[PDB]
From a paper:
The FimA subunits of the pilus rod are single domain proteins of 16 kDa with an incomplete, immunoglobulin (IG)2-like fold that lacks the C-terminal β-strand (G-strand). In the structure of the pilus rod, the FimA subunits interact via inter-molecular donor strand complementation, in which the N-terminal extension of each subunit, termed the donor strand, inserts as a β-strand into the preceding subunit and completes its IG-like fold. In 2010, Sukumaran et al. discovered that the FimA proteins from the enteroinvasive pathogens E. coli, Shigella flexneri, and Salmonella enterica have a second function besides formation of homopolymeric pilus rods; soluble forms of FimA, independent of FimC, act as inhibitors of host cell apoptosis after pathogen internalization by stabilizing the interaction between hexokinase and the voltage-dependent anion channel (VDAC) on the surface of mitochondria. We showed that all three FimA orthologues investigated (FimAECO, FimASHI, and FimASAL) were capable of folding to an alternative, self-complemented, monomeric form of only marginal thermodynamic stability that likely represents the FimA species that acts as an inhibitor of host cell apoptosis after internalization of the respective pathogen.
FimAECO, FimASHI, and FimASAL were produced as reduced, insoluble proteins in the E. coli cytoplasm without their N-terminal signal sequences. All proteins were refolded in the absence of the chaperone FimC under oxidizing conditions to allow the formation of the single, invariant structural disulfide bond. The purified proteins were crystallized, and their X-ray structures were determined at 1.5, 0.89, and 1.69 Å resolution, respectively. All FimA orthologues crystallized as self-complemented monomers, and all structures strongly resembled the previously reported NMR structure of the FimAECO monomer. Specifically, all three FimA monomers showed nearly identical immunoglobulin-like folds, completed by intramolecular donor strand insertion in a parallel orientation relative to the C-terminal F-strand. The global folds and registers of parallel donor strand insertion in the X-ray structures of FimASHI and FimASAL were the same as those observed in FimAECO, and all three structures showed high surface complementarity between donor strand and the rest of the folded FimA domain. The only significant difference in the mode of donor strand insertion was found for FimASAL, where Ser6 instead of Val5 occupied the P5 pocket, which caused a more extended conformation of the FimASAL donor strand segment Ser6–Gly7–Gly8. The overall pairwise Cα RMSD values for the three X-ray structures were 0.30 Å for FimAECO/FimASHI (113 Cα atoms), 0.51 Å for FimAECO/FimASAL (154 Cα atoms), and 0.57 Å for FimASAL/FimASHI (110 Cα atoms), and the only minor conformational differences were restricted to loop segments 15–20, 37–45, and 89–97, and residues 51 and 81.
Residue numbers in the entry: 4 to 163
Write the structure that this text describes.
């Protein structure tokens, strides 16, 4: 018996600015796999899947230029809960409904995906610095439907 599954990926891009730090070329164009989940196991508004880790790696940082770094995220927001990213599918596949994608900083704080809600400021050390995040699905309806649940977002660095 086939199973109904919801899952997909989120793709992140950012500007390559030679500011206080330089963003790794790997981090500035990356795809994070969120997993596949049994659709029937989403049974209530607010159900969430496991947090999937991803990183933004900064190279060649100079704390003398800027003591701290933070990140904001921008994408098309879910209409039911605008603190989540709306999900989409490829043309050959159906889109899941009743879920959005949540991004959290390393303090476990969700970030509104409006391009102006920045993560907790992190102290920089000379050279390479790792900024850690997670992503997951969050149900926006009690009854969800199966399919692909992908998103595209941009990230924005703030050095202070």
């Amino acid at each position: 018996t086939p199973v109904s599954v919801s899952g997909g990926t989120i793709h992140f891009e950012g500007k390559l600015v030679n500011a206080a730090c330089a963003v790794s070329t790997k981090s500035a164009d990356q795809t994070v796999t969120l997993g596949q989940y049994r659709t029937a196991s989403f049974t209530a508004i607010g159900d969430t899947t496991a947090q999937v880790p991803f990183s933004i790696v900064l190279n060649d940082c100079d704390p003398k230029v800027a003591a701290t770094a933070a990140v904001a995220f921008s994408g098309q927001a879910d209409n039911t809960n605008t603190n989540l990213l709306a999900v989409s599918s490829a043309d050959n596949s159906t889109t899941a409904t009743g879920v959005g994608i949540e991004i959290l900083d390393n303090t476990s704080s969700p970030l509104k995906p409006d391009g102006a809600t920045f993560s907790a400021k992190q102290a920089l050390v000379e050279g390479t610095n790792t900024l850690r995040f997670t992503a997951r699905y969050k149900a926006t309806a009690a009854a969800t439907t199966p399919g692909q649940a992908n998103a595209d977002a941009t990230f924005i660095m703030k050095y202070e």
